[PDB]
C-alpha cells in the first residue's frame with residue numbers, strides 16, 4: 001500500500017484510525033499514529049491487506065504509537081488533502097495562533113488554528129496530558145491522523161476532542177471546538193524515528 005498521512009487503516013479487523021506520518025527506524029518502515037488506536041502487536045490493514053503491526057504505544061498518560069510495516073509498503077512524505085497532497089518537509093513546532101490543518105478518514109482535511117498547548121484531556125481511560133489544542137473540526141475515525149501546517153511542518157497526531165451527537169465537532173463554531181493532538185517531537189525521540197520528507 002502507499003502510506004500517506006490521513007488515510008484509513010483498521011486494527012484487528014475492528015476499529016478504524018487514520019495514518020499520521022511515514023517514518024523509518026533504521027531499515028524498518030513505519031507510520032506514527034495514536035496510542036489509543038491499538039495495543040502492541042495488533043494487526044493493521046489497509047484496503048483489506050495486512051501492512052504491519054503495532055510496535056509500541058503509550059495510552060493513556062500520552063497518546064502515541066508507531067506501527068512497523070512490512071518491506072513491501074511504500075512510504076511517502078505526503079498527507080492527503082482531498083485528491084491532492086501536502087508535502088512533509090520537517091517537524092518545526094508551530095506556536096499558539098499559527099494556522100494548521102489535519103487530515104483523517106472521517107472528516108477529510110480541515111484547517112483552523114492552534115489555541116492552546118499543554119492541555120489535559122480527561123478520557124474515560126485516564127488523563128492524557130500535554131496535548132496541543134486547535135479548532136479545526138474532526139470526527140470519530142480521525143484519530144491518529146496528521147496535523148500539519150500548509151508549509152509542510154508536521155505537528156502531531158489526532159488524539160480526541162468534543163465530538164457532538166453527530167460524531168464530529170464540525171456543526172459547532174470553531175470558537176467552541178476543542179480538537180487535541182499529541183505533539184510529534186516527543187514521539188520521534190521516544191522511539192528513535194526519522195520522518196520521511198520530500
Ligand SMILES: *[B]([O])([O])[C]([N]C(=O)[C]1[C][C][C]N1C(=O)[C]([C])[N]C(=O)OC([C])([C])[C])[C]([C])[C]
Nearest residue numbers: 036121122123139140141142143159160161162
Ligand atoms: B478516534 O479514535 O477516531 C477518536 N478519538 C477518541 O474517541 C478519543 C480516544 C479516547 C476518547 N476520545 C475522545 O475524543 C473523547 C471521546 N473526547 C473527550 O473526552 O473530549 C474532552 C473535551 C472531554 C476531552 C476521534 C478523534 C474523535
